[PDB]
Amino acid sequence: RWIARTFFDGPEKNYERTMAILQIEAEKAELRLKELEVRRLMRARGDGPWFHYPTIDKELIDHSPKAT
Amino acid sequence: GWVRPDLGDLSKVTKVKTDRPLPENPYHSRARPEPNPEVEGDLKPARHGSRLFF
């Protein structure tokens, strides 16, 4: 009982805790698997703003020339 | 018949002209597919590094 105080965390700790660490771990694992799933799609088809190659130009010239 | 300009033409406008309407797609056939939708809203830190650690 003396060893339980100021030397031990207790059974309440690491049961309420660790599950909190697992809750962050579950979020870290699912989003990393989602990142592997998103990059597998975004690289194959140019749909989103990920792995997009730069284009030539947006605007260059529109004025009237001396063309035929 | 005698009329001589001592300056030039300097781009004259034809307001009386009608004939055919100007916008009628001179060369364009396809409208080109819509670009990637712009993400609106401020980014928030949620995962805080999806690397091997932290």
* Cα A16 to Cα A23, A36, B10, B46, distances in angstroms: 11, 31, 85, 22
Q: Do B50 and A31 touch (CB under 8 A)?
A: yes
Strand, helix or coil for residue A34: helix
Tell me the resolution in Å.
Answer: 4.1
Q: How many CB atoms lie within 10 A of CB A37?
A: 10
d(CA A6, nearest CA chain B) in Å: 29
| Determination technique for this entry | cryo-EM
Measured distance CA(A18)–CA(A22) in Å, rounded: 6
Strand, helix or coil for residue B18: coil
Measured distance CA(A8)–CA(A35) in Å, rounded: 40
CB-based contacts of A29-36 (< 8 A; 24+ apart in sequence): A31/B47, A31/B50, A32/B50, A35/B50
d(CA B50, nearest CA chain A) in Å: 6
Measured distance CA(A39)–CA(A18) in Å, rounded: 31
Give the residue from A37, A32, A60, A55 showing the smallest Cα distance to B36: A55
Our measurement of the distance from residue B46's CA atom to the centroid of its chain's CA atoms, rounded to an integer in Å, reads 39
A10 touches chain B (CB under 8 A): no
Tell me if A41 sits within 8 A of A47, measured CB to CB: yes
